[PDB]
Design an enzyme around this catalytic site. Structure first.
Site, PDB file in Angstrom:
ATOM      1  CE1 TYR A  78      39.416  38.322  40.878  1.00 39.44           C
ATOM      2  CE2 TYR A  78      40.105  37.817  43.135  1.00 39.44           C
ATOM      3  CZ  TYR A  78      39.887  37.416  41.827  1.00 39.44           C
ATOM      4  OH  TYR A  78      40.145  36.102  41.482  1.00 39.44           O
ATOM      5  N   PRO A  85      34.755  27.005  44.318  1.00 39.69           N
ATOM      6  CG  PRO A  85      35.555  27.330  46.519  1.00 39.69           C
ATOM      7  CD  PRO A  85      35.319  28.059  45.185  1.00 39.69           C
ATOM      8  CG  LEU A  86      31.262  27.267  48.474  1.00 37.75           C
ATOM      9  CD1 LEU A  86      30.817  28.479  49.286  1.00 37.75           C
ATOM     10  CD2 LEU A  86      30.916  25.981  49.218  1.00 37.75           C
TER      11      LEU A  86
HETATM   12  N1  LIG Z   1      41.428  32.594  38.873  1.00 41.60           N
HETATM   13  C1  LIG Z   1      40.145  32.780  38.376  1.00 41.60           C
HETATM   14  O1  LIG Z   1      39.940  32.796  37.205  1.00 41.60           O
HETATM   15  C2  LIG Z   1      38.957  32.931  39.400  1.00 41.60           C
HETATM   16  C3  LIG Z   1      37.655  32.993  39.002  1.00 41.60           C
HETATM   17  C4  LIG Z   1      36.666  33.106  39.945  1.00 41.60           C
HETATM   18  C5  LIG Z   1      36.995  33.165  41.279  1.00 41.60           C
HETATM   19  N2  LIG Z   1      38.304  33.122  41.673  1.00 41.60           N
HETATM   20  C6  LIG Z   1      38.690  33.176  43.086  1.00 41.60           C
HETATM   21  O2  LIG Z   1      37.986  31.918  43.828  1.00 41.60           O
HETATM   22  C7  LIG Z   1      37.311  32.416  44.877  1.00 41.60           C
HETATM   23  C8  LIG Z   1      36.042  31.600  45.122  1.00 41.60           C
HETATM   24  O3  LIG Z   1      35.316  31.529  43.909  1.00 41.60           O
HETATM   25  P1  LIG Z   1      33.898  32.391  43.797  1.00 41.60           P
HETATM   26  O4  LIG Z   1      33.835  33.448  44.839  1.00 41.60           O
HETATM   27  O5  LIG Z   1      33.759  32.973  42.409  1.00 41.60           O
HETATM   28  O6  LIG Z   1      32.639  31.311  43.948  1.00 41.60           O
HETATM   29  P2  LIG Z   1      32.304  30.379  45.207  1.00 41.60           P
HETATM   30  O7  LIG Z   1      33.319  30.572  46.353  1.00 41.60           O
HETATM   31  O8  LIG Z   1      32.200  28.952  44.743  1.00 41.60           O
HETATM   32  O9  LIG Z   1      30.803  30.888  45.730  1.00 41.60           O
HETATM   33  C9  LIG Z   1      30.742  32.254  46.060  1.00 41.60           C
HETATM   34  C10 LIG Z   1      29.230  32.564  46.152  1.00 41.60           C
HETATM   35  O10 LIG Z   1      28.727  31.785  47.089  1.00 41.60           O
HETATM   36  C11 LIG Z   1      28.134  32.716  48.243  1.00 41.60           C
HETATM   37  N3  LIG Z   1      28.535  32.029  49.512  1.00 41.60           N
HETATM   38  C12 LIG Z   1      29.757  31.769  50.011  1.00 41.60           C
HETATM   39  N4  LIG Z   1      29.599  31.108  51.173  1.00 41.60           N
HETATM   40  C13 LIG Z   1      28.268  30.958  51.376  1.00 41.60           C
HETATM   41  C14 LIG Z   1      27.571  30.361  52.400  1.00 41.60           C
HETATM   42  N5  LIG Z   1      28.115  29.746  53.521  1.00 41.60           N
HETATM   43  N6  LIG Z   1      26.234  30.333  52.377  1.00 41.60           N
HETATM   44  C15 LIG Z   1      25.552  30.906  51.332  1.00 41.60           C
HETATM   45  N7  LIG Z   1      26.239  31.501  50.321  1.00 41.60           N
HETATM   46  C16 LIG Z   1      27.602  31.516  50.349  1.00 41.60           C
HETATM   47  C17 LIG Z   1      28.707  33.870  48.105  1.00 41.60           C
HETATM   48  O11 LIG Z   1      27.717  34.969  48.405  1.00 41.60           O
HETATM   49  P3  LIG Z   1      27.839  35.797  49.812  1.00 41.60           P
HETATM   50  O12 LIG Z   1      28.916  36.903  49.711  1.00 41.60           O
HETATM   51  O13 LIG Z   1      26.483  36.445  50.047  1.00 41.60           O
HETATM   52  O14 LIG Z   1      28.207  34.815  50.915  1.00 41.60           O
HETATM   53  C18 LIG Z   1      29.066  33.992  46.608  1.00 41.60           C
HETATM   54  O15 LIG Z   1      28.024  34.542  45.906  1.00 41.60           O
HETATM   55  C19 LIG Z   1      36.985  33.867  44.476  1.00 41.60           C
HETATM   56  O16 LIG Z   1      36.697  34.663  45.536  1.00 41.60           O
HETATM   57  C20 LIG Z   1      38.307  34.264  43.735  1.00 41.60           C
HETATM   58  O17 LIG Z   1      39.325  34.546  44.808  1.00 41.60           O
HETATM   59  C21 LIG Z   1      39.272  32.998  40.748  1.00 41.60           C
END
Ligand SMILES: NC(=O)c1ccc[n+]([C@@H]2O[C@H](COP(=O)([O-])OP(=O)(O)OC[C@H]3O[C@@H](n4cnc5c(N)ncnc54)[C@H](OP(=O)(O)O)[C@@H]3O)[C@@H](O)[C@H]2O)c1
Length: 286
Positions: free
Chosen positions: A71, A216-217
């Site tokens: 990351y 998850p979002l």
């Molecule tokens: N193991 C794997 O292969 C893998 C792959 C992907 C992710 N991950 C991990 O899972 C975690 C979560 O997944 P993700 O970050 O990809 O997607 P996510 O949590 O489902 O959604 C993140 C997106 O949603 C926005 N967001 C979050 N809270 C918000 C809110 N209250 N209101 C409006 N927008 C919001 C964020 O932008 P803002 O910053 O502007 O809030 C970001 O762009 C990652 O951080 C990572 O640690 C792991």
């Protein structure tokens, strides 16, 4: 969101999960992938806001943080070290297994010596002797599975890794890994709109393995769905909060790690732990 869950968010309202039966977290965690620049690359644009997100975690009860060597790379772990070391009351999970040629560009490299270099780099950046939860970021299809699993068993024997997780794996791959080490968690893509890993979730629940849903979002794309919006409106919630409350109720082994780089969004995400959905709500959402 206007509901009462907004008043004093507390991740402990999601319940406590003992990873491997011994390492306690509040289930609603924090995904640290987004405190990086565009393409998960370099410093975030507003670095000071990213630092404030990390500083905000403790007062919101968040004690589970998921990051990865890749990351940034390095940047996410470094900011976590800057703001959270020595991690009293925190579980920092990290990963190795992916290389980063550039923004949005990822390469799987599970060669044992490369996995070991990544783990050693994480130990040095985080300034710890042992990773609480270390995750194989992907099983590299270019390297024999058993050599990767054998390297990770060596990490455990060497005392460098306490609990081991997998990521984006099938039941078959979990059972194969289990011949080398206990699988404390898996981290698979999962949310209200993407339940392809439903079988793996049931396997985790049947075996007391933590299930960490990534995206998850659904990468923030929770808009445009009347039934989700109706459940949200009834709770004075946002659709994203209902998406998190949904997976918290779906299974008692689910450990959501919503990712954000903004304090306001972090607060909204943690507040989802204070929502009580009915079984009418769950029926409507599914
Ligand atoms: N193991 C794997 O292969 C893998 C792959 C992907 C992710 N991950 C991990 O899972 C975690 C979560 O997944 P993700 O970050 O990809 O997607 P996510 O949590 O489902 O959604 C993140 C997106 O949603 C926005 N967001 C979050 N809270 C918000 C809110 N209250 N209101 C409006 N927008 C919001 C964020 O932008 P803002 O910053 O502007 O809030 C970001 O762009 C990652 O951080 C990572 O640690 C792991």
């Amino acid at each position: 969101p206007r509901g009462s869950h907004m008043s004093e968010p507390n991740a402990a309202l999601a319940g406590q999960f003992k990873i491997g039966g011994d390492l306690t977290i509040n289930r609603l965690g924090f995904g640290a992938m987004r405190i990086t620049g565009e393409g998960i690359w370099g410093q975030p644009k507003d670095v000071e806001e990213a630092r404030r997100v990390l500083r905000r975690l403790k007062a919101l009860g968040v004690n589970f943080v998921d990051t990865a060597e890749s990351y940034g790379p390095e940047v996410s772990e470094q900011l976590i070290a800057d703001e959270l070391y020595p991690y009293d009351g925190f579980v920092i999970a990290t990963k190795a297994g992916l290389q980063r040629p550039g923004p949005n560009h990822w390469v799987q490299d599970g060669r044992p010596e490369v996995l070991r270099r990544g783990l050693e780099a994480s130990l040095k950046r985080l300034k710890v002797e042992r990773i609480d939860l270390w995750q194989l970021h992907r099983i590299d299809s270019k390297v024999p599975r058993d050599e990767q699993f054998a390297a990770i068993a060596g990490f455990v024997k060497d005392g460098l890794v306490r609990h081991v997780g997998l990521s984006e794996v099938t039941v078959e791959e979990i059972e194969a890994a289990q011949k080398y080490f206990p699988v404390a968690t898996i981290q698979n893509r999962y949310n209200l709109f993407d339940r392809a890993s439903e079988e793996e979730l049931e396997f985790c629940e049947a075996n007391a393995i933590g299930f960490i849903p990534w995206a998850p979002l659904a990468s923030g794309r929770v808009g445009g769905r009347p039934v989700l919006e109706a459940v949200a409106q009834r709770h004075g919630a946002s659709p994203g909060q209902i998406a998190l409350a949904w997976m918290l109720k779906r299974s008692p082994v689910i450990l959501p790690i919503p990712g954000t780089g903004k304090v306001a969004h972090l607060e909204e995400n943690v507040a989802a732990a204070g929502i009580t959905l009915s079984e009418g709500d769950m029926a409507e959402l599914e």
